[PDB]
């Protein structure tokens, strides 16, 4: 936690051998193709070094690096979009910079200046501005990472750290413009996070354990995992996305609900953007309240449920049409009802993100 680094001290080293761009008409799979440059800033005793943009390359880590033994690592994830006016913009970057600072502090990694980092990221995207796709639904995924880098096997606060950022072009989540549903496996046996735990931070350690559970879901015929918490089986998250339910509550009011930030939930940026956007329309009750399987099951049998979806940077708004709970199939009417609300959220985010409409959430590069 020492005096930050300055974007003003940014050293830039253009690449010698530019990677071959993907090229229109080619399959863009999520996070598999990377741009030409990367950001890199190191930390140690005298504090931060000067930030540098340099050619994309491999990292040289000491075998005893704490990032590889004790998981002193955290990451972030956000997107940049290119509008028809050829301008590139980042979606509410400030929220990500804040989340990252908090995660850093939870792991005892060096704090830094949120705006300086933001500026450095803007310069990086500027350098690889040509990598940003402009098709439909495409964008640039930005991946900042901060890791401890102490060459010691002692479990302690790092005296050396490393912060880098890489970029990669990602195609439309829904090829064709049409949204498609996903089935979810809901099994109480699996717990991704506990209160007093660290599930409300974007730390590597929270995902490794989920790989096995995801395979278990696929084998059962489901695409994603619905994480349940507590004896009351309350819904918390879906895969790596926040969960929303559009229904008529028990009291007869039409509402949109998502679980509260009780500690076992990651504060999604898209999640916050949906609440804000919905609060603004003032067309129905928008609330943060606990949701349990029983409440869901009752609503389903009474036909009060309209749409259920997941939210996250990867898949802005993701429709859910089926849940496998206790070896029992629960069909969710999401698609037969539109999905009206989902389609609306989608259209509005698209106009804001692609510059069709001027908005303060967008950060120009």
Ligand X SMILES: *Cc1c(COP(=O)(O)O)cnc(C)c1O
Please report, in range form, the residues annotated as the binding site for substrate: 141
Sign of CA dihedral 141, 267, 215, 308: negative
Site residues for a copy of itself, 188-217, by CB under 8 A, read 188-191, 194-198, 203-212, 214-215
Decide if residue 200 touches ligand X (CB under 6 A). no
Decide if residue 56 touches a copy of itself (CB under 8 A). yes
155: tokens are 């479990």
Binding mask 216-255 for a copy of itself (x = CB under 8 A): ------------------------x---------------
Binding mask 88-127 for ligand X (x = CB under 6 A): ----------------------------------------
| Pairwise CA distance, residues 307 & 216, whole Å | 25
**CB 201 → a copy of itself: shortest distance, Å?**
9
Site residues for a copy of itself, 6-45, by CB under 8 A, read 29-32, 34, 38
Residues 277 and 348: beta-carbon distance below 8 Å: yes
Nearest-10 Cα torsion for 35, 37, 42, 48: -120
Q: What are phi and psi of 236, to 5 degrees?
A: -120, -60
Cα 331–Cα 334–Cα 339 angle in degrees, nearest 5: 165
Residues 224 and 217: beta-carbon distance below 8 Å: yes
Site residues for ligand X, 64-93, by CB under 6 A, read 77
Name the 3-class secondary structure at 235: strand
Residue (of 190, 338, 324, 332) closest to 264 by Cα position: 190
198 touches, from a copy of itself, ligand X, none (C-beta below 5 to 8 Å by class): a copy of itself
Among 145, 186, 265, 300, binds a copy of itself (CB under 8 A): 145
| Pairwise CA distance, residues 339 & 292, whole Å | 23
| Pairwise CA distance, residues 124 & 131, whole Å | 11
Contact set with a copy of itself (CB under 8 A): 29-32, 34, 38, 56-65, 67-73, 75, 106-108, 141, 143, 145, 147-148, 151-157, 164, 166, 168, 188-191, 194-198, 203-212, 214-215, 240
List residues binding ligand X (CB under 6 A): 77, 202, 237, 240-242, 266, 268-271, 312-313
């Amino acid at each position: 936690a020492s005096s930050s680094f300055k974007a003003a001290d940014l050293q830039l080293e253009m690449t010698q051998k530019p990677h071959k761009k993907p090229g229109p008409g080619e399959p863009l799979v999520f996070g598999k193709t990377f741009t030409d440059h990367m950001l890199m800033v190191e930390w140690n005793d005298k504090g931060w070094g000067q930030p540098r943009i340099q050619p994309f390359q491999n990292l040289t880590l000491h075998p005893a690096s704490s990032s590889l033994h004790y998981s002193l690592q955290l990451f972030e994830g956000m997107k940049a979009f290119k509008g028809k006016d050829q301008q590139v913009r980042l979606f509410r970057p400030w929220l990500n910079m804040d989340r990252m600072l908090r995660s850093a502090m939870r792991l005892c990694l060096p704090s830094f200046d949120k705006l300086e980092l933001l500026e450095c990221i803007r310069r990086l995207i500027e350098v690889d501005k040509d990598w940003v796709p402009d098709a439909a639904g495409t964008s640039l995924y930005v991946r900042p990472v901060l890791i401890g880098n102490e060459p010691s096997l002692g479990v302690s606060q790092p005296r050396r750290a490393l912060l880098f950022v890489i970029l990669c072009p990602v195609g439309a989540y829904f090829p064709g413009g049409s949204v498609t549903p996903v089935s979810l496996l809901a099994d109480p046996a699996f717990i991704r996070a506990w209160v007093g735990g660290v599930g409300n931070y974007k730390l590597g350690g929270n995902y490794g354990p989920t790989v096995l559970v995801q395979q278990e879901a696929l084998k059962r015929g489901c695409e994603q995992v619905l994480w349940l918490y507590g004896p009351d089986h309350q819904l918390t998250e879906v895969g790596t996305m926040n969960i929303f339910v559009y229904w008529t509550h028990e009291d007869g009011v039409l509402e949109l609900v998502t679980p509260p930030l009780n500690g076992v939930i990651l504060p999604g940026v898209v999640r916050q953007s949906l609440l804000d956007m919905a609060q603004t329309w003032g067309e129905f009750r928008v609330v943060e309240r606990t949701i349990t399987m029983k409440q869901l099951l009752r609503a389903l049998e009474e036909g009060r449920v309209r749409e259920v979806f997941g939210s996250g940077t990867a898949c802005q708004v993701c429709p859910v049409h089926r849940i496998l709970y206790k070896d029992r199939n629960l069909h969710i009417p999401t698609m037969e009802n539109g999905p009206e609300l989902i389609l609306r959220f989608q259209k509005e985010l698209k106009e804001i993100q692609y510059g069709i409409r001027a908005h303060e959430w967008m950060f120009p590069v």
